[PDB]
Write a protein that binds this DNA or RNA. Structure first.
Ligand SMILES: Nc1ncnc2c1ncn2[C@@H]1O[C@H](COP(=O)(O)CP(=O)(O)OP(=O)(O)O)[C@@H](O)[C@H]1O
Ligand SMILES: [Mg+2]
Ligand SMILES: [Zn+2]
Ligand SMILES: [Zn+2]
Ligand SMILES: [Zn+2]
Lengths: 141, 101, 610, 115, 59, 98, 47, 57, 162
RNA sequence: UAAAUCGAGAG
DNA sequence: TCATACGCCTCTCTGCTTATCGGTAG
DNA sequence: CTACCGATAAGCAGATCTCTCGATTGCGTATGA
């Protein structure tokens, strides 16, 4: 009976909540295959962009709030990374908790965002980091 | 004709109105899920097979499902999707606002 | 299902309940009296188990609705048991409630304050106040007890009132898994505490201790030597079903306050009082003749097992009724003590045997009495319980129309998403295409071709459900029917409908193709159909074998044909084989060429090949 | 394929009642097309093509006063191979009651046949 | 017949009956056919045209 | 489609208030009438009480109870409900457009 | 244990709303998972 | 009685004959092929009592 | 007639089914599917034989929509393209009442029964001598003590005495 | 046309 | 003498549930 | 001192994919023939 609801929170048929997010990220296991392959995505950027068409996915999307909160939270965690697990008092919850990942571009997981930032920092490459980040955030959405 | 039915009708419509989520605050996925697309295509094909009026050019097509897919491509399907939330509240999206893929 | 026959009403919810003796007497169409199913001639006998008021039998018109066998829904009947009989389902509850009760003050052996606290807790949990129930315990704070009862009741009344106004609960009560668990735990603890302590504190009197020997006999033990002393200071017989029924009826009438919340998981909006004459069945309900039809070989006719059980029921009932009549004359004509005593012992044995009989009728395992036997007739419970029972074999899985099965053979010449449908399957499986302006030419050609030449049609379902078969029609008749395919309907009621042509499965259709055991999603996809007119095997491409886990091996797998547009569009899109490229187990791909295509690629892609 | 079936007429009158069903043809208006697969004594000709719906044996019953026929009960076409008339060990020289009929079905190798 | 194609599933009356106001049924009778013909072949008009003139004149 | 629409689909009548499927039945017309579907439990015998009364097949006259609708249910559900009624358990089905 | 769970549900008059797939299958209702997790309405242009 | 035993496989006895199982004592000597036929006469069974226990030793 | 209107307007709230072919013309589709057959037929729920209707409405399934919107919502059943929706319409129904006075003509006369035609549209069931000697004519006041409605058309019976 | 038990098999 | 209807005619796992021997306060 | 409360010891109850064939169906007895 347990199934994904329209709140992105999975729950049983009667209504009792089991998880607030599918695995914490609400990403499909079938479509997770090429979300970490940053090299492959960079290589086929043009084909992936033609597939996704971000131009037609703007009038029904919000792009700024989720990205701002994600940057703030990322800086917060980086500042507080060298802290014990129990002492890490929560002031900024993960962006997925508040902003719907299916409606707010940039509301991605902490693991995916960390991997994307590490790849963009270690690999300095016409595609710039901004367009690649936007494409991969749309891919996550 | 009793008020013992008027009261029931009034309370039913009141509960239904309190259930509906206003268009200004629906917070679901703007995209059309695969299940929604499949159900819309099937229902439109059923209606076409039952002699409902069509809006697209029938370029030598005999499959109601194919006609439904053509209408969905042209975004001329006159159907409204009532997404249901776990408590009972619903948001009345239509195929026009919903974007495919 | 016919898409031209819409149904408006829907079964929103189902609530269980216990049938009362009054309604079934009002509901029934006839009372079954004699235990003779069939007479010498085989004609149904009035008052028997196959009475014509219980449903049309064979060629006999039903005497209740006046309809033939195929048209008679089957009207239920009832029988009148002579003595109230214990329901074998509720016998544990009967035992629990007969124990932990006082026969003198007609209350439970628990304190009135304790049962009031439990009733208040259960009433709070009815609406879902899972916290107020625990907060009620801290109101501990002979004459003050009446005030304590009011204080707890006042707290319960306002706790519900504040929860209903602000929207935390509606008047129907909130029921969730955790409140159900808390209610179950509370009820279990309540029963355990009830059964624990004797010496009923309402009047301070010891009560006899009951015992059971099977599910039909209940005995009680008198008070012991130390126990018999204190009974008068205040100032292993066999008990009867009638007197236990009276005792429990009076006890329930006295303790309705707690019993209502014990016997309801939701607020009792119906306000109906619970009664102890619910574990006791004075009337049995016989299923209609349609559900009790007899088995039939070519000649070997076998009786219904339910009919045998009900006939034995009626035999025992008639014997008891005759013995009671003989008991009456032995009393008006006064005789010696033993003369009535022997037949009274026989009557008690008859009561015991009718209890065992009803226990056997409901539950086969609870039956007592078997020396050698051949096979113990399953009860109605045995018809719904095991893997072969009604549930797991007839609603959790059913045999399906419009579906085929055969051996699979490979075919690398189909487009890795299609199925090779043999022409033998292609002439039997059909789809109900309704005729329209765009479908008229194709369906006219199919009707003209007929049920034997693929592509073709086998039936032409009219607007008013009239099915016209094309099996025994000539070419001229089929041509005339195709000409009369799309015509303006004269009937006003059927002016919104059009004829449906049961066309053969064409090349554009989609089928569900499944292999057992289905260990995951991929073992049941939807392939497009390709009609290969050679032989009689379902021909499958080579990529699907990895997901289906089959070899062309003598392996067999089914092929279901969905019969409506929703299922077509939803097997073509959601269940189609293209969408199952990656299994959800770990996201790894599951399709691809297997054995010689790999070697061919290794040899072709080597740089030694020009 | 070799398959045999036993046409036991004396299976409904299992009691001591005398014979009420005899092999052969009655005097009613039975169809004349029954003689294209059945002999004069209500038995199938040897080497006969029998398919679904084709008569297998003709028996006459003294009660219904009609000529009824048993029927082949398989979709696979078959050939009549052997017809045996089984007698009764009882002293009573009863009529022909039980008859054994053997079929022959050509199992040529089609695809799907395991080798 | 009597299917969900020509008969309502439920025909509950919402309110109490109300007699005809303004004393003239012609405010509806003259406008009933005005919106009808400006099928139903079950004497739906044949026997319905005999109830309008009687309140006005003679048949 | 695999479990109901193509296995045991039946448009069985149902009573709106009693919520029972096999308690309903058909009536016997007098002359040129219509065999309307009626509920046995709903109907009251004419002793305890035209187009208001319906009779059974044995000549008994029952008044009232002639409100019911049609629902799409499997037949095995009806068989299970009959088996439960044999156990003394009543299943009540709530019909939406009451 | 169809018998045991039937008594435990009929003693307390457990009304069920037909939410799990098993109940909907028993009563022959459209499921609530997947394509049955929503309704479909028609935009009719009347006067 | 012996013909019934042969035609059904069930062993009806008042002592049990020191044999654990009751049914499945006679099998039809199938003649699909001579290998099958001759294999019928050389086979042995551990007993139908051993066809249900889960001890694979 | 007998100083009684006998023509009562009874609004109803009926649950109907709309065909897929009546989608761009839904109100007319509903009226032609359900309301037109009810004309000139005796319906017990409304009270009597319906003479007509006016003021058809379709109850929207989107409550937040206005009450004057020209585009309404019909609920489509999962198993069937047919749509079900509530409706509101006023029914003009002839409502005879038992024990009252009704005026009706006589068209067909028989040996036993007298054929009374109320407004020449209420079927019911050779000059002779009356109480005053006047020949039997159509104009008379009869009673409605007994009403026949088992047949396809409702009928009334009665006698001059009250 | 049935229903149960046993036996022999296929994946 | 002798036939068919009536009357029966012994080698696995998880809990739950009840009964009975110890202890603490009053 | 003795009743309420636990803590084992024992017993009890419920469990441990589809498809095709074939074969088979009780003794026992007791009275009207
Ligand atoms: N008890 C059982 N349950 C389910 N499936 C079974 C089964 N017993 C056998 N099978 C089937 O028998 C077939 C054997 O296939 P597998 O042994 O699993 C692949 P394999 O070992 O590579 O065979 P190969 O050596 O012939 O190439 C499977 O398709 C399996 O479904
Ligand atoms: Mg294989
Ligand atoms: Zn009947
Ligand atoms: Zn007491
Ligand atoms: Zn009812």
């Amino acid at each position: 009976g347990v199934h994904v609801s329209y709140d992105n929170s999975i729950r049983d048929a009667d209504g009792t909540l089991v998880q607030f997010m599918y695995g914490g990220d609400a990403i499909d296991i079938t479509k997770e295959s090429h979300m970490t392959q940053f090299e492959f995505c960079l290589d086929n950027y043009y084909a992936l962009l033609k597939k996704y068409n971000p131009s037609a996915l703007i009038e029904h999307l919000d792009v700024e709030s989720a990205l701002k909160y994600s940057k703030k939270t990322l800086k917060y965690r980086k500042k507080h990374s060298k802290e014990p697990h129990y002492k890490q008092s929560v002031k900024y919850d993960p962006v997925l908790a508040k902003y719907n990942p299916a409606k707010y571009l940039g509301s991605v997981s902490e693991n995916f965002q960390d991997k994307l930032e590490s790849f963009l920092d270690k690999n300095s490459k016409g595609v710039n980091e901004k367009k690649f980040r936007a494409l991969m955030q749309l891919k996550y959405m | 004709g009793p008020e013992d039915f008027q009261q029931h009708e009034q309370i039913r419509r009141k509960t239904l109105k309190e259930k509906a989520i206003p268009k200004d605050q629906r917070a679901t996925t703007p995209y059309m899920t695969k299940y929604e697309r499949a159900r819309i295509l099937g229902t439109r094909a059923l209606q076409i097979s039952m002699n409902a009026p069509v809006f697209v050019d029938l370029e030598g097509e005999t499959d109601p499902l194919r006609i439904a897919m053509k209408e969905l491509a042209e975004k001329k399907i006159p159907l409204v999707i009532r997404r249901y939330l776990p408590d009972g509240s619903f948001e009345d999206w239509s195929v026009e606002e919903l974007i495919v893929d | 299902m016919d898409i031209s026959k819409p149904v408006g009403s829907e079964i929103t919810s189902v609530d269980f309940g216990i049938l009362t003796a009054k309604e079934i007497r009002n509901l029934s169409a006839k009372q079954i009296t004699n235990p003779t199913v069939l007479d010498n001639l085989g004609h149904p006998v009035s008052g028997g188990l196959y009475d014509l008021a219980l449903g049309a039998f064979l060629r006999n018109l039903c005497s209740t609705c006046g309809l033939d066998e195929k048209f008679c829904p089957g009207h239920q009947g009832h029988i009148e048991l002579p003595v109230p009989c214990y329901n074998p389902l509720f016998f544990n509850q009967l035992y629990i409630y007969l124990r932990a009760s006082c026969l003198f003050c007609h209350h439970f052996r628990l304190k009135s304050v304790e049962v009031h606290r439990y009733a208040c807790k259960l009433r709070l949990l009815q609406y879902g106040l899972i916290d107020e129930s625990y907060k009620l315990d801290e109101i501990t704070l002979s004459t003050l007890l009446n005030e304590l009862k009011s204080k707890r009741s006042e707290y319960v009344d306002m706790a519900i009132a504040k929860a209903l106004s602000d929207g935390r609960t509606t008047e129907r009560g909130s029921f969730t898994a955790t409140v159900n668990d808390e209610r179950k735990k509370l009820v279990h603890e309540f029963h355990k505490k009830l059964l624990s302590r004797g010496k009923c504190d309402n009047c301070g009197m010891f009560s006899p201790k009951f015992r059971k020997d099977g599910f039909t006999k209940i005995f009680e033990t008198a008070l012991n030597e130390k126990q018999i002393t204190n009974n008068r200071v205040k100032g292993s017989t066999y008990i009867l079903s009638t007197e236990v029924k009276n005792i429990l009826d009076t006890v329930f009438r006295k303790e309705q306050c707690v019993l209502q919340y014990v016997f309801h998981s939701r607020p009792n909006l119906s306000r109906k009082l619970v009664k102890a004459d619910s574990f006791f069945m004075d009337v049995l309900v016989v299923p209609p003749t349609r559900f009790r039809l007899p088995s039939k070989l070519g000649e070997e006719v076998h009786e219904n097992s339910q009919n045998q059980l009900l006939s034995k029921v009626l035999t025992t009932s008639l014997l008891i009724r005759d013995l009671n009549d003989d008991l009456s004359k032995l009393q008006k004509d006064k005789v010696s003590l033993e003369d009535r005593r022997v037949i009274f012992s026989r009557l008690m044995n008859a009561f015991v045997t009718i209890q065992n009989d009803v226990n056997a009728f409901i539950d086969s395992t609870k039956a007592q009495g078997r020396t050698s036997g051949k096979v113990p007739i399953p009860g109605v419970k045995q018809a719904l319980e095991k893997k072969e029972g009604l549930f797991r074999k007839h609603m959790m899985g059913k045999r399906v129309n419009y579906a085929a099965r055969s051996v699979i053979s490979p075919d690398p010449n189909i487009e890795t998403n299609e199925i090779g449908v043999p022409p033998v399957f292609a002439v039997k499986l059909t789809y109900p295409e309704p005729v329209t302006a765009y479908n008229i030419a194709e369906l006219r050609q199919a009707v003209i071709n007929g049920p034997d030449k693929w592509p073709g049609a086998t039936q032409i379902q009219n607007e008013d459900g009239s099915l016209v078969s094309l099996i025994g029609m000539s070419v001229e008749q089929r041509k005339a029917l195709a000409n009369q395919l799309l015509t303006p309907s004269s009937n006003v009621s059927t002016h919104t409908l059009n004829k449906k042509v049961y066309r053969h499965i064409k090349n554009r259709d989609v089928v569900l193709m499944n292999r057992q055991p289905t260990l995951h999603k991929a073992s049941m996809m939807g392939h497009k159909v390709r009609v290969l007119p050679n032989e009689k095997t379902l021909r499958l491409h080579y990529a699907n074998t990895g997901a289906y886990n089959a070899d062309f091996d003598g392996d067999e797998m089914n092929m279901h044909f969905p019969q409506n547009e929703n299922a077509r569009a939803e097997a073509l899109n959601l269940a189609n084989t293209d969408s199952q490229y990656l299994t959800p187990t770990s996201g790894s791909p599951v399709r691809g060429l297997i054995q010689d295509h790999i070697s061919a690629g290794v040899w072709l892609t080597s740089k030694d090949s020009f | 394929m070799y398959k045999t079936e036993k046409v036991d007429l004396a299976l409904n009158r299992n009691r001591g009642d005398p014979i009420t069903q005899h092999f052969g043809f009655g005097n009613d208006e039975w169809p004349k097309e029954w003689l294209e697969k059945l002999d004069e004594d209500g038995l199938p000709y040897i080497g006969t093509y029998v398919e679904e719906g084709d008569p297998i044996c003709a028996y006459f019953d003294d009660t219904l006063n009609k000529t009824k026929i048993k029927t082949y009960h398989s979709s696979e076409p078959a050939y009549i191979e052997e017809v045996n008339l089984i007698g009764d060990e009882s002293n009573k020289f009863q009529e022909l009651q039980t008859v054994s009929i053997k079929y022959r079905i050509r199992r040529t190798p089609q695809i799907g046949d395991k080798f | 017949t009597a299917t969900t194609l020509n008969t309502p599933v439920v025909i509950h009356a919402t309110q109490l009956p109300q007699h005809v106001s303004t004393d003239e049924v012609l405010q509806f009778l003259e406008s009933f056919i005005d919106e009808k013909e400006n099928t139903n072949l079950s004497s739906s008009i044949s026997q319905l045209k005999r109830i309008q003139r009687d309140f006005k004149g003679l048949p | 489609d695999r479990l109901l629409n193509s296995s045991d689909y039946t448009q069985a009548s149902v009573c709106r208030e009693c919520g029972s499927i096999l308690t309903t039945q058909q009536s016997v017309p007098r002359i040129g009438s219509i065999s309307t579907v009626c509920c046995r439990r709903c109907s009251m015998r004419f002793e305890d009480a035209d187009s208001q009364i319906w009779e059974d097949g044995q000549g008994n006259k029952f008044v009232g109870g002639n409100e019911t609708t049609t629902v799409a249910i499997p037949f095995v559900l009806k068989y299970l409900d009959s088996e439960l009624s044999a156990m003394g358990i009543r299943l009540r089905y709530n019909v939406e457009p009451k | 244990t169809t018998c045991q769970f039937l008594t435990k549900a009929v003693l307390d008059n457990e009304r069920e709303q037909l939410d799990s797939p098993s109940a909907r299958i028993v009563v022959g209702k459209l499921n609530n998972v997947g394509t049955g997790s929503f309704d479909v309405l028609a935009k009719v242009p009347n006067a | 009685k012996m013909q019934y035993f042969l035609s059904t496989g069930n062993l009806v006895s008042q002592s049990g004959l020191d044999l654990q199982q009751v049914s499945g004592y006679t099998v039809v000597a199938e003649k699909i092929n001579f290998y099958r036929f001759i294999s019928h006469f050389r086979m042995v069974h551990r007993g139908s009592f051993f066809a249900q226990l889960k001890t694979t030793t | 007639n007998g100083t009684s209107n006998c023509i009562v307007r009874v609004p109803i709230a009926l649950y109907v089914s709309l065909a897929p072919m009546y989608l761009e013309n839904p109100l007319q589709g509903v009226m032609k599917q359900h309301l037109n057959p009810l004309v000139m037929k005796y319906n017990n729920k409304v009270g009597g034989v319906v003479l007509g209707y006016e003021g058809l409405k379709i109850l929207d399934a989107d409550p937040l929509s206005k009450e004057d919107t020209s585009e309404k919502l019909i609920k489509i059943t999962p198993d069937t393209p047919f749509g079900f929706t509530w409706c509101h319409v006023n029914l003009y129904v002839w409502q005879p009442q038992v024990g009252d006075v009704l005026e009706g003509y006589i068209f067909i006369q028989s040996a036993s029964h007298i054929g009374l035609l109320i407004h020449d549209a209420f079927n019911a069931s050779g000059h002779w001598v009356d109480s005053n000697g006047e020949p039997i004519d159509g104009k008379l006041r009869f009673t409605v003590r007994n009403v026949h409605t088992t047949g396809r058309v409702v009928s009334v019976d009665g006698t001059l005495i009250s």
